[PDB]
Amino acid sequence: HGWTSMLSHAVLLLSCYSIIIMFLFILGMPTLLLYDFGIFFLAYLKGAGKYISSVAEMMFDYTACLVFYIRILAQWIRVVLMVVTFISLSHYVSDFDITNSALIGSENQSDSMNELNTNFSMTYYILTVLPGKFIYWIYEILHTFFVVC
């Protein structure tokens, strides 16, 4: 979506419309398929009835048509999982540590440069604590790649 950055005030405008288009036209696919079946559409789903009671079969046909739509609609929970996993990775990267101790000739003198800053974490920071933050970073992205794929 990079090529649409200046086309509107929202970079993800086309993506936010496309997910709605994707939802509506996928939802209409089973509906148009039942229309193509005709009035016999319930026999295409469940098959032959079992009881002489039309009211009894009416309940079983109401379930087969519901199951027919749940097979499609319940798959959008996979899209929810992919979005949540992608947001948690963006939250970890956006909040990742970056201070003046990593800058070359910093001029941000008021951002903790001239203050006493001790911590209560494990010492040997770049050997113990900093690699641990990177280990969890690798887990976040490897877990994301496995989920979204």
Partner 1 sequence: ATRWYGRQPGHLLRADTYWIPNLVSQRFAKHQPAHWDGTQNMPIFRLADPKHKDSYMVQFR
Partner 2 sequence: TLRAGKNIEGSGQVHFGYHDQKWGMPAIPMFQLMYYELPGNSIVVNPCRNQNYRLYFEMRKKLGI
Partner 3 sequence: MNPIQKAWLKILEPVSYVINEKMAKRTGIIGKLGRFFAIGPREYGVHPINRMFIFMNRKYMAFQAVALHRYSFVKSLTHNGFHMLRVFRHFAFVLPATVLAGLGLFVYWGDDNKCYSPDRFPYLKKRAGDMALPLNSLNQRTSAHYIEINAIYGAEMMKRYHKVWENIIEERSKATDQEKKTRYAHPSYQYSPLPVVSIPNVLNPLNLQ
Ligand X SMILES: CCCCCCCCCCCCCCCCCC(=O)OC[C@H](COP(=O)([O-])OCC(O)COP(=O)([O-])OC[C@@H](COC(=O)CCCCCCCCCCCCCCCCC)OC(=O)CCCCCCCCCCCCCCCCC)OC(=O)CCCCCCCCCCCCCCCCC
Ligand Y SMILES: CCCCCCCC/C=C\CCCCCCCC(=O)OC[C@H](COP(=O)(O)OCCN)OC(=O)CCCCCCC/C=C\CCCCCCCC
Ligand Z SMILES: CCCCCCCCCCCCCCCCCC(=O)OC[C@H](COP(=O)([O-])OCC[N+](C)(C)C)OC(=O)CCCCCCCCCCCCCCCCC
Where does this chain bind partner 3 (CB under 8 A)? 25, 28-29, 32-33, 36
| Per-residue x/- track, 84-113, ligand Y (CB under 6 A) | -------------xxx-xx-----------
Q: Which one of ligand Y, partner 3, partner 1, none is in contact with 102 (Cβ closer than 5 to 8 A by kind)?
A: ligand Y
Interhelix angle for 125-148 vs 76-94, to 10°?
160
Q: Which one of partner 3, partner 1, partner 2, none is in contact with 29 (Cβ closer than 5 to 8 A by kind)?
A: partner 3
Chain-centroid distance, C-alpha 105: 41
Burial class (CB in 10 A: 0-12, 13-18, 19+), 148: middle
- Cβ atoms of residues 72 and 26 within 8 Å: yes
Q: Which one of partner 3, ligand Z, partner 1, none is in contact with 25 (Cβ closer than 5 to 8 A by kind)?
A: partner 3
